[PDB]
Amino acid sequence: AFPELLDRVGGRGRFQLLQAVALVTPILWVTTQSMLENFSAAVPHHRCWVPLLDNSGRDVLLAVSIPPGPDQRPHQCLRFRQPQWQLIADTEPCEDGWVYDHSTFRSTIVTTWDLVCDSQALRPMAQSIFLAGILVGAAVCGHASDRFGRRRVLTWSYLLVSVSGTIAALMPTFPLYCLFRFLVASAVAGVMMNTASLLMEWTSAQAGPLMMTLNALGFSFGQVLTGSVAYGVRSWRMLQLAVSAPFFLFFVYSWWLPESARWLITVGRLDQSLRELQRVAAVNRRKAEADTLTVEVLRSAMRLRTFISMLCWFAFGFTFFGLALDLQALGSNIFLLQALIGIVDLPVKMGSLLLLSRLGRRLCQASSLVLPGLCILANILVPREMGILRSSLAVLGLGSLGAAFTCVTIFSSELFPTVIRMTAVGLGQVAARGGAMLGPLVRLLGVYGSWLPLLVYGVVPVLSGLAALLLP
Numbered sequence: 001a002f003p004e005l006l007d008r009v010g011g012r013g014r015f016q017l018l019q020a021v022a023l024v025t026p027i028l029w030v031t032t033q034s035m036l037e038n039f040s041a042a043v044p045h046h047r048c049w050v051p052l053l054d055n056s057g058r059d060v061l062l063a064v065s066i067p068p069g070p071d072q073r074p075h076q077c078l079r080f081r082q083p084q085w086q087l088i089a090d091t092e093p094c095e096d097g098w099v100y101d102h103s104t105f106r107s108t109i110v111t112t113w114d115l116v117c118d119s120q121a122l123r124p125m126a127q128s129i130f131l132a133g134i135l136v137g138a139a140v141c142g143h144a145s146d147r148f149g150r151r152r153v154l155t156w157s158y159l160l161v162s163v164s165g166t167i168a169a170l171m172p173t174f175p176l177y178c179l180f181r182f183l184v185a186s187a188v189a190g191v192m193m194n195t196a197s198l199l200m201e202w203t204s205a206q207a208g209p210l211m212m213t214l215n216a217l218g219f220s221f222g223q224v225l226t227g228s229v230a231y232g233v234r235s236w237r238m239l240q241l242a243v244s245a246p247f248f249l250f251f252v253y254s255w256w257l258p259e260s261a262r263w264l265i266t267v268g269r270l271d272q273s274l275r276e277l278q279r280v281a282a283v284n285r286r287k288a289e290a291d292t293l294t295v296e297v298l299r300s301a302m303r304l305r306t307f308i309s310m311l312c313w314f315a316f317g318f319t320f321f322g323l324a325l326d327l328q329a330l331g332s333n334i335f336l337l338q339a340l341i342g343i344v345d346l347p348v349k350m351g352s353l354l355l356l357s358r359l360g361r362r363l364c365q366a367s368s369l370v371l372p373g374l375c376i377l378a379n380i381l382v383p384r385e386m387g388i389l390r391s392s393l394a395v396l397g398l399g400s401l402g403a404a405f406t407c408v409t410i411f412s413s414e415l416f417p418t419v420i421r422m423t424a425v426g427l428g429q430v431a432a433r434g435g436a437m438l439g440p441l442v443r444l445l446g447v448y449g450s451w452l453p454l455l456v457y458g459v460v461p462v463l464s465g466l467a468a469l470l471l472p
């Protein structure tokens, strides 16, 4: 009887739009704390400290103390025991600290904790830890909102994000920074899950397409917001503070939004449900049918396809979260990137969807994975002087991968006995989230050659997409 009550109280109107505007804005900043691990842990050019240079012909002094490296650069991990003045065999690891290049970034976490050379694996692990935190927090919060409400959990998760972010920028050692970020990730996952549930709960009929389109648009704009904010603040201790502070301001205003009116009924909190419904009616201005509500009415109210979807979600999560966090290897000008991604994404997603869906439902699913995977794979062959071509290929690949989610979210999930889609989208989301903690771990394989990470990162989407043609 809840849909009839919602029709009696509203639908579309004013409040159902103010709630969307008030809830979408936190998603922009939520995106900022997931892709922030691209301007915070940025690796500049690091050389070895020398007693000759850098105080107790600059070019000759640099050439005599540091042996030449393989990639046409001074060596980043070794120095000469004694100035080899024979240069008009014996090398010792750096023992006086590195010297970094401060020309685009002032202080990253790499600069402050020397995560270079031998201690290199720790950098692709500080991201897998965050994704494991998101995975854990997206599973714990599921069993903590059906008993504590759907609005209180969001309000407290805002405060948790704010406090954990404001603390994580003031730690003196790596292990604690790898734990407070875990807490931030769990709280962010809770925020996203509850925002989606609240967005759908209050809306009917015109709820499926538009509201879930709004969330994807929010993420796409959050990417541009991340780029713009990173363009301004250059340090890393003043970036986490500036990104985590707005969540406290969101927490204060989050005390006025009404709670879900469908959860209040199944628990017996009829009186407050009535208060919430009448309050919503006044904002919606449809204060004509609300006189009907007199407690009693609310008292009466109170396999192959599945595996294919599993693999598609896993491939999307794997490739996207392994590629979007290393944009220093897809080209240059990191600030210009991370902003063209969303601007490409929205036109690309809309235009690709509109044209391809007319071919068929399976064709759109197939062409949204093979195309970006092949675009990424065809990036190795390009020589390292056509910067525009490789940058365009990478941007197109990421934009198409972003569109794959939408093309597999509301267009897909029908490939089942077709009762309701929240018993399948939620199952796919656990695979998508569990396919990202196995993400940046592939980037640990930069040794044994450097082409292999990109090769795997392009092959996996291609095989996953080509397996979708085997539906029967």
Ligand SMILES: CC(C)(Sc1ccncc1-c1ccc(C#N)c2ccccc12)C(=O)O
Binding pocket: 030, 031, 034, 134, 192, 215, 216, 219, 220, 317, 345, 402, 403, 405, 429, 432, 433
């Ligand atoms: C776990 C995923 C699949 S990814 C995600 C997790 C945490 N924070 C942000 C995103 C995210 C990033 C870029 C997107 C794009 N384009 C996007 C689109 C839809 C949903 C999430 C994202 C989810 O959240 O379902």
